[PDB]
Amino acid sequence: IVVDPSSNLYYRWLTAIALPVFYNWYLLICRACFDELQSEYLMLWLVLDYSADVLYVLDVLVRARTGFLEQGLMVSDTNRLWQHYKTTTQFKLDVLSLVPTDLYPEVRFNRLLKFSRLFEFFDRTETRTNYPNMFRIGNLVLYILIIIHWNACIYFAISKFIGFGTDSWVYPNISIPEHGRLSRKYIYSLYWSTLTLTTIGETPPPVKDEEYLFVVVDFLVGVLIFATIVGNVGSMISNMNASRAEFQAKIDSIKQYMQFRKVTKDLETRVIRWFDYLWANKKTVDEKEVLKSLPDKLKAEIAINVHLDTLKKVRIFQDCEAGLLVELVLKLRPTVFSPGDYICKKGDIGKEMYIINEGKLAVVADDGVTQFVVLSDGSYFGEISILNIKGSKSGNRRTANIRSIGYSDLFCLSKDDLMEALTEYPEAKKALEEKGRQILMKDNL
Amino acid sequence: AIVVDPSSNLYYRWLTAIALPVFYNWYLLICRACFDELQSEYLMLWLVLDYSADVLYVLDVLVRARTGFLEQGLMVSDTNRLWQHYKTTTQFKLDVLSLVPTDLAYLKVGTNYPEVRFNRLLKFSRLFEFFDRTETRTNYPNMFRIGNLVLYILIIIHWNACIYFAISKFIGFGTDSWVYPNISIPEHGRLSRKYIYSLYWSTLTLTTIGETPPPVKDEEYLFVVVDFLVGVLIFATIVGNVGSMISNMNASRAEFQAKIDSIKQYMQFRKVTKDLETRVIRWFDYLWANKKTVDEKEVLKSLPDKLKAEIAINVHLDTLKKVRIFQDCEAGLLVELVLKLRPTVFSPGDYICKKGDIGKEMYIINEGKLAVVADDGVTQFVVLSDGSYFGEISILNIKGSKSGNRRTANIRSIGYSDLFCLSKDDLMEALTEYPEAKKALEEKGRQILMKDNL
Amino acid sequence: IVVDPSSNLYYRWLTAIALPVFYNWYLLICRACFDELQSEYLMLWLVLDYSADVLYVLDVLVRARTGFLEQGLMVSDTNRLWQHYKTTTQFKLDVLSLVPTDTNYPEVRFNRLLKFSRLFEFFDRTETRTNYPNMFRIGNLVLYILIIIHWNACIYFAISKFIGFGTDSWVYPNISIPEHGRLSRKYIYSLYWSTLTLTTIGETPPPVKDEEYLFVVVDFLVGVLIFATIVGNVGSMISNMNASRAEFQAKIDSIKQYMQFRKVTKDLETRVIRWFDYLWANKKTVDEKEVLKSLPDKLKAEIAINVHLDTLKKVRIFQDCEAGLLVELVLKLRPTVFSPGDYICKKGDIGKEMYIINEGKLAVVADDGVTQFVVLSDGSYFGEISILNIKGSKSGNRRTANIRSIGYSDLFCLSKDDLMEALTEYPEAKKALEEKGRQILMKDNLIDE
Amino acid sequence: LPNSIDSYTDRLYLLWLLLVTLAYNWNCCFIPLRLVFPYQTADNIHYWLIADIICDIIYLYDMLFIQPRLQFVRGGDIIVDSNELRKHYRTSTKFQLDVASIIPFDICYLFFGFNPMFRANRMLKYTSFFEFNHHLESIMDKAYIYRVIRTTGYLLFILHINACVYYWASNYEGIGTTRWVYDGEGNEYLRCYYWAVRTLITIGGLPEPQTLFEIVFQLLNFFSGVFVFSSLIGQMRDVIGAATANQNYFRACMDDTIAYMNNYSIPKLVQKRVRTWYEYTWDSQRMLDESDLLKTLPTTVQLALAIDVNFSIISKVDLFKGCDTQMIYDMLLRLKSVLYLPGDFVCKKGEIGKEMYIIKHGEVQVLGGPDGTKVLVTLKAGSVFGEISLLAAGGGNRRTANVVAHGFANLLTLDKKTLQEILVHYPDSERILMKKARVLL
Ligand SMILES: Nc1nc2c(ncn2[C@@H]2O[C@@H]3COP(=O)(O)O[C@H]3[C@H]2O)c(=O)[nH]1
Ligand SMILES: Nc1nc2c(ncn2[C@@H]2O[C@@H]3COP(=O)(O)O[C@H]3[C@H]2O)c(=O)[nH]1
Ligand SMILES: Nc1nc2c(ncn2[C@@H]2O[C@@H]3COP(=O)(O)O[C@H]3[C@H]2O)c(=O)[nH]1
Ligand SMILES: Nc1nc2c(ncn2[C@@H]2O[C@@H]3COP(=O)(O)O[C@H]3[C@H]2O)c(=O)[nH]1
Ligand SMILES: *[C@@H]1O[C@H](CO)[C@@H](O)[C@H](O)[C@H]1NC(C)=O
Ligand SMILES: *[C@@H]1O[C@H](CO)[C@@H](O)[C@H](O)[C@H]1NC(C)=O
Ligand SMILES: *[C@@H]1O[C@H](CO)[C@@H](O)[C@H](O)[C@H]1NC(C)=O
């Protein structure tokens, strides 16, 4: 079998191999430095180390049968997969992490060489999850807890090397039953390392030169840790409200424009209420900028999936070419209208055709509140004035006032957009002109 | 009957009136749960405030049963459909869980355990909604962001003070050096002293100052290391929030200063003369200081076409209607013409147009002062002022004109002008759907030039 | 000989002159303030100061022969280089750092610290030349704070010696005690005090006199300011490190919100999510027209002919074209990335683009099922006749068969309008292209119109 | 004194704003110091009164003889008439703050004795400090240095105010009563400033608060110190991120180009040439493109910056001598700046010709020797070559000689297509150009 790195089985294996790597780092430095975790829970550490080595050789096999991409296609032959896995330095890191050094748990510090699986699990979870900033604070707390734990183990090893209870800086005398417990040892070492790496420093001061030097190095490392934590959380907060700051900057610039150009209070509060609607309905980003980073094939497929069943129900586009409808939904433009907004007044130049989506319009009667007919979802208007038929009775002029009752979302197919969409389909252009001429001869010509 | 608009002002008044007792419930419920003297000494006050909070909670579920929502762009106004749309939400479950009558157990324990009212903290969504509506509604966004961050970290510091006092009560008062001192001492037994020292300890721990006594037991060591890591996280979010405030407060000023440094580097690299360099720099400083530095086309790009047309009407239509050739034109033609108007700014002494130049623009003066100077320099013949216009005959291109499209006079700027430019090509693109109006404009220009010189 | 300031020999000399500058700063302040480091290792400091002064003299001699760009070309006239050096303030700083001021008082050698510009130039050139600029910025910040901690240690020891050893609880302890009298403990306790003061921790003994109070206030203020700037620099570096990831995630979340609001079906939603996961996974997040936007056409043409020219020369109509026409045609190419199963062009579609296959495998499939007639590979092409549009074609700008992607293809499109734009300066080559297309259409299928 | 102060090109006005800033900073510093500390003794009161009279005299001179002479812009035109300047100052909002600052509450010294709380309205003249900051940032080249100095001064002022409030709390609780209050040993201001530094920088290490007033004081001071340190870090981060934004943008686009050329396996000679282009562009221009900078400016300043750079150069060209000034201006605005590396061919002998080259800050060499490498003419900066190739139709003009760049030549290019799209609006100069092409070719 061949696994591929983009599937879900690969991410489940990334979790299943990120568990024993974190176990190896954490509990290997703890057992190497504390000497009672290793002594008391010996069968538990034997079981967990056997499980970690089993998952390590299984990771070697999975990396041996993990595919890659050449010429866009996934490679699936195990010989070339094995050679490509072998020529990489990750193969040497895996073999060096699986040397039989068990033939004092510090000999198992080769097992810490599989850190790339933990970093790959963190990267894949960060790109897969839907709470990326919550996972980022989780990863930051995990990294700084690893450093706090490793510094606690280093402090206990240094105080054991100097001597227990010989100094005021080192760990107290473990022959006393209060300082002799493993829980007291680990939690006091963790408290010391936390005070020293959070640059609080309420610890007893050093008395020897190696202790002074270790405390200097520890306080500078804690300074770098605090700077990294603050930088990551600050960039995360700057990313968490970048869209809010962009929309507030746009609102502030438009309000400054409306104050500088002396826009009246009615239009000013109409613009303010429009932006309040645009934020309270989460429409803060425009689709014309949203659909630029996509390729043309996915843009065309999204335009089909949104507008093709709507455009196919238009009476002039019932028997047109599928490629012509593809170009037409590529040239569709969506606009949102406020309540009471006139889409078109009677007597204006008709150069756009609007198809209603998720809205409710009304044909009002000569700048009045009385409505003749109420248009609804899926319907359209302006289907004839944009075709530019010779000998029209109307002459590209709207014969009715259409107001918006609520917030409508129309799709605007312009005259120029239809003319540049009809330039590579001339037979479809003549058929569209024939259908418009037929509709005009039926109703009024 | 009555349906409250969620975008109105009455909804924000109710958001304030329901964000008061939620914050009260959080703060004083953890305080009365962990401090044990606030509950006993002020029992009538807490009965009054809990009854008022429960009244506001049932009024909130009655309000949430009657807020409209947007489908098909219209506000839903039938109480039955509003009630089913509320009942099919998790917020209805959170509200009926926040209104669970645990006051029977509160009366069974003798009104000494306010821990049964901890389900009242399940209406945090009203507090977050009030903060969101205020941060999009108010005129002081950075000041509100600082107040919101201060409120959040004070809730956390207060909860950690209550947790520290509960841990000290569980371990023993005054039995250790880390726990709260012996409350039988009359100085340590005051409730103000208890709360203020617990809040002081919690602030020192959660802000990574740590001027506190050191732990002496394993649970105290573990609580202190967990509190110190939570405190370094809290300090990181405080520094990041204030840094984002500072970065957002002068973002426009930093953008203008980056523009100024870019133009200065261009004028140093291209060896632009010093007089024009100071002219351009003083021009941009004027545009900043008089609050007109932004580009109108880039500012109005985020608006829809209907609001852009309405703003262009409200700014330029009453000024374009005073032009003599556009006196009797179609309303849609004037709307397209004020949409085609592009603005330009001018410096003192800047030439708008010189004599013998090809006329392709029609300028309309707005907040400026121009001057029809001679060809030698600055000798004002006519001082052109606000509301006036020029260049309206040369862009019409009247056939058989003895002046053609040439500028008959030199026009300089005296101060800082803000003209509105209508291009000849933009006029011809706006006159494609109006052939009758194009012929009328041509005939009016022909009549004016026949009155003057044809 | 003229040393080119953009060469590699100049960077080798920047290393060889930034070594004694860092030596001079660090060990000159330590020897000046500790009075035993100068006294014990005296021959070592004589050797190192002789080497540093010889390197300073050679630095003046190298700066006297370093070129500069005037009107785009490097000046090689040694007299012009010498006068241009002489009219600089760096010449004054170098000759002030080379005055013969020269045993137990190495504070007469403090003019040697005036060559800080060579250390700053070395750091700037290393950050320019490296491939890990944020890692070098972290290293440079660490070196700056180490220099500051060391200088504050020397200042604290000098202040303690001026006040009196062991006369206060704040000053350095009595050096007549054999524990405190060691040079290692002197330097290491001064470094410990300086770390605890400049990092604004403050767990050292508090001052007892007014001069000590004033020095500790000034030292805490210098440390707070410096550390705040350090934390702001690290934060700006982190925010500019994850800026591309933040922009790509903003684009992903915007398109996800659009697809959720417009009720796009789950199959197309999964396809767009998989394409975005492939993009970042392949770090192909940037766009070609965005990353080659500011380059000149000469360098864009060199970049384009190092990838596309060997494929464009194999095209049956672009066999014997002109070199300049092939340059224009490889500059007119536009990349298009396709998903697996994406149809490039179907039967009946409008033909206006010629696709060039680069790192992909296409298949000319039939209409009903996936029956691959020809498997088009890397270096191949299709669609030249549709962009030629020869008069009298029965096709009429329509593709014959269907072509879909088997895997992720990066096709490069030469459209018909771009071909006619590149053929404005080559009318004979346009006529030859039309003749070759008419010959191909004559041997395949063509009406005479 | 002049009748009108420019307030932009007047350095005497910057010095006067410095004097009013020094008076305002003297007031803000020495009103709480004299209010709290016992430094306003009866044997020292005359020097304090002399300094307060000097500060009030500076305030009065600013209110009366300088600010009414400030030029301003009303509706675009610059106002010079002193009557209009005086009414604009009198009806301003600065005059309200100046009057409310210079309100003589010093006459209450006869009633309530010498007390600097009556001078506390003199801290309402902050607008002069703010315009001094604005004018100093405008005259300074690198204003982040003054931003850092201002942030340092704000930190020192808030620590000074904290030292004054701590000495007030020590005098209120009693000096030397508890362990937390000031004991009275050495310099009162220096030791209270030490306490303020260690508290508002959240260093600690001081005696613990004993009573409830001291615990509340220490808690509020530590919270304020957390926010002061956070604002200090945020200000330094804003200064650093604004100071290095252009350099980091240039490095980001250079890394994007390098990642592209590494993804497409482009050779190391081409990668070295691209890196040389990026390095010389950062050395000379300190920006990637001038076109996306100039396209953000208005058309009038675009035309002025194009004229002042290239108008004499194109007016020396014989081909566009009969053409008209507006078409020449459009061809000025539509020029393109390209940078050639040393040894780059700008015109290969035999290739097509479609551009006119304006060489600015460079040197190109026309190779027309017998082998093809001998230099005939070395065209220095400000020259124009290949201008007759702008008028040929179709293929037309082929290049007749190899022209290479000697060093880094920064040519300016006008395309034939660009000249045609300019010429579709200017028919008379179009006829002159075709007649010149017919008589020359
Ligand atoms: N004239 C007219 N148009 C109607 C009516 N009901 C819906 N409409 C649409 O309203 C329109 C307004 O613009 P159009 O002239 O473009 O075309 C018209 C029709 O599509 C009706 O009763 N009369
Ligand atoms: N010739 C002229 N033009 C004037 C005068 N007052 C205002 N104007 C406008 O100034 C102009 C400058 O450009 P135009 O030739 O286009 O047209 C001219 C008029 O519209 C005046 O007294 N003479
Ligand atoms: N019809 C056809 N086209 C092929 C074949 N092999 C490669 N191609 C290319 O596939 C094409 C698809 O588009 P075109 O019609 O534009 O032109 C066709 C050819 O250039 C083949 O066997 N048949
Ligand atoms: N051949 C040639 N061209 C020169 C010389 N001096 C300047 N030039 C210009 O250099 C040119 C390079 O391009 P062109 O062939 O287009 O035309 C040539 C001339 O306009 C010279 O001595 N010989
Ligand atoms: C630790 O305690 C034991 C007995 O309790 C004692 O013998 C030993 O000396 C002590 N160690 C130190 C370093 O004091
Ligand atoms: C607290 O004080 C009371 C009386 O002062 C005493 O009885 C009690 O034991 C004290 N508690 C502790 C823990 O010391
Ligand atoms: C330092 O020690 C010496 C000898 O131990 C002693 O004479 C001297 O007084 C000490 N100095 C101080 C300041 O105590």
Numbering used by the authors:
A (entry chain B): 159 to 261, 270 to 611
B (entry chain C): 158 to 611
C (entry chain A): 159 to 260, 268 to 614
D (entry chain D): 206 to 646
What do the authors of the reporting publication say about this deposited model?
First, to increase A3 and B3 expression level and protein stability, we removed amino acids 1–151 and 1–78 on the N-termini of A3 and B3, respectively. Third, A3/B3 was reconstituted in nanodiscs with simply 1-palmitoyl-2-oleoyl-sn-glycero-3-phosphoglycerol (POPG) and 1-palmitoyl-2-oleoyl-sn-glycero-3-phosphocholine (POPC). Second, a cGMP-bound closed-state structure, named ND_cGMP_closed (36.6% particles) was also obtained, at a resolution of 3.11 Å. This structure is essentially identical to GDN_cGMP_closed, the closed-state structure of full-length A3/B3, with an r.m.s.d. of 0.44 Å, indicating that the N-terminal truncations do not alter A3/B3 structure. In the closed state, the C-helix of the CNBD is in a “down” position. In the closed state and intermediate state 1, R410 of A3 and R456 of B3 are the only amino acids on the gating ring (i.e., helices A’B’) that interact with the TMD, mainly D289 and E292 on S4. In ND_cGMP_closed and ND_cGMP_intermediate, R442 projects to the ion conduction pathway with up and down orientations, as in GDN. In ND_cGMP_closed, R442 interacts with V396 of A3R in the up orientation but with S404 of A3L in the down orientation. Strikingly, even though all four subunits of all the channels are bound with cGMP, most of the channels are in closed (36.6%) or intermediate states (55.8%), and only a very small fraction of the channels is in the pre-open (1.7%) or open states (4.3%).
